[PDB]
Design a protein around this ligand. Structure first.
Ligand SMILES: [Ca+2]
Ligand SMILES: [Ca+2]
Ligand SMILES: [Ca+2]
Ligand SMILES: [Ca+2]
Ligand SMILES: [Zn+2]
Length: 316
C-alpha cells in the first residue's frame, strides 16, 4: 500500500521487545519500505489460502499474543535481508531487490514453515512440538535462503541435490543467527522446538548424529522417504561446514578451522557461481574447493581445510 514510513514497537514470540518498520495509511501495516522493494507480512488467519491479508494494526503497537509471530517474521526477514546485503553484496533473494513476503498463522496447529516458490509461510505450531516458527531467526533465514538457492543454483529438492539445498539453508540460517548475535549456536530451531524440553533442537550441525542424522557419507540414507532424505543426509554436509569453520577431528581426520566469515564466503561463491540444479555431494566438494581457490589461492590453508573437512565426512 502507499503511505508514510514509520516505526512501531511490539513483542515477539519469545517475549522480547523490538522496533519494526511499518507503513501508515489509515491503519499501520507491516510493510517495511526501507529494504529493497519492501518486506510485507500477512495474516493467513488460520486458513491455508495464501497470502491472506496484509497485516493491519490500529495503533502501531504490537503487544497482543496474536501479533507475536508477525512481529518476528517481519523483523527477522529484515535482519536476513541485511545479512545478504552487507556481507555478500546481494540485494534480496533474486539479487534485484524483490519484495519479501511472509504469511503467519498458517493453518491450525501447523508444525512447519516453508518457502513455497513465491513467499515464506509460518505455522503456529501445536504448542508442544513447536511454538510459532517465526520465533527462530535460524528458521526464518533457513527458509529465505531457499529463495536464494532457487534463484541461483536451482538445486532440485530430491536426493543429493536436495540434501545440499537443505544444508545450504541450515548453514546460512546459522550464519545469520551469528550475525544477529542472538544466543548463536550450531543447532537448528532450538528457540521454537519443544517448549517443554530445554537443551534440544531439530537438527545439530556440530553433531548431527545426536538426533540420528548421518555425519558421514557411509551412513547416508538411500531410501525414498523425505524426498530421498533431503532433511536427513543434509547432516553430512552440515558436519563438513561445521568442521571447516570450527575445526576438529572427526573419524580420525583432523581439520583446522578457518572461521565463520570465510565459511560463508566460500559457500556463497560455490552456490552462486558453481552449483547447478543436479549437483551431487562430490560436485559440491569440487565447487567448494574451486571457490576457496578463487578466493585464497590453491596453496592456502583455506583450500586445505575444505579438503580435509570433506575427507572427514567421506565425500570424495
Ligand atoms: Ca495494536
Ligand atoms: Ca540459538
Ligand atoms: Ca540455532
Ligand atoms: Ca526444546
Ligand atoms: Zn529447508
Amino acid at each position: 500500500i502507499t503511505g508514510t514510513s514509520t516505526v512501531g514497537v511490539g513483542r515477539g514470540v519469545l517475549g522480547d521487545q523490538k522496533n519494526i518498520n511499518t507503513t501508515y495509511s489509515t491503519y499501520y501495516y507491516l510493510q517495511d519500505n526501507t529494504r529493497g522493494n519492501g518486506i510485507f507480512t500477512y495474516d493467513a488467519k488460520y486458513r491455508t489460502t495464501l497470502p491472506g491479508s496484509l497485516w493491519a494494526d490500529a495503533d502501531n503497537q504490537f503487544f497482543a499474543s496474536y501479533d507475536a509471530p508477525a512481529v518476528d517474521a517481519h523483523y527477522y526477514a529484515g535482519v536476513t535481508y541485511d545479512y545478504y546485503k552487507n556481507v555478500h553484496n546481494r540485494l534480496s533473494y533474486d539479487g534485484n531487490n524483490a519484495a519479501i513476503r511472509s504469511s503467519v498463522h498458517y493453518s491450525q496447529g501447523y508444525n512447519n514453515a516453508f518457502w513455497n516458490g513465491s513467499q515464506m509461510v509460518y505455522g503456529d505450531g501445536d504448542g508442544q512440538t513447536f511454538i510459532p516458527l517465526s520465533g527462530g531467526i535460524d528458521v526464518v533465514a533457513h527458509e529465505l535462503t531457499h529463495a536464494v538457492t532457487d534463484y541461483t543454483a536451482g538445486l532440485i529438492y530430491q536426493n543429493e541435490s536436495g540434501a545440499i539445498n537443505e544444508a545450504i539453508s541450515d548453514i546460512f540460517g546459522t550464519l545469520v543467527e551469528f550475525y544477529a548475535n542472538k544466543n548463536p549456536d550450531w543447532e537448528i530451531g532450538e528457540d521454537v522446538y519443544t517448549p517443554g524440553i530445554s537443551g534440544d533442537s531439530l537438527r545439530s550441525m556440530s553433531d548431527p548424529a545426536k538426533y540420528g542424522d548421518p555425519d558421514h557419507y557411509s551412513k547416508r540414507y538411500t531410501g525414498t522417504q523425505d524426498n530421498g532424505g533431503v532433511h536427513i543426509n543434509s547432516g553430512i554436509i552440515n558436519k563438513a561446514a561445521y568442521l571447516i569453520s570450527q575445526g576438529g577431528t572427526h573419524y580420525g581426520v583432523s581439520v583446522v578451522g578457518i572461521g565463520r566469515d570465510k565459511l560463508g564466503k566460500i559457500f556463497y561463491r560455490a552456490l552462486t557461481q558453481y552449483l547447478t540444479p543436479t549437483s551431487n555431494f562430490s560436485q559440491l566438494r569440487a565447487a567448494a574447493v574451486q571457490s576457496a581457490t578463487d578466493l585464497y589461492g590453491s596453496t592456502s590453508q583455506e583450500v586445505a581445510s575444505v579438503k580435509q573437512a570433506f575427507d572427514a565426512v567421506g565425500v570424495k
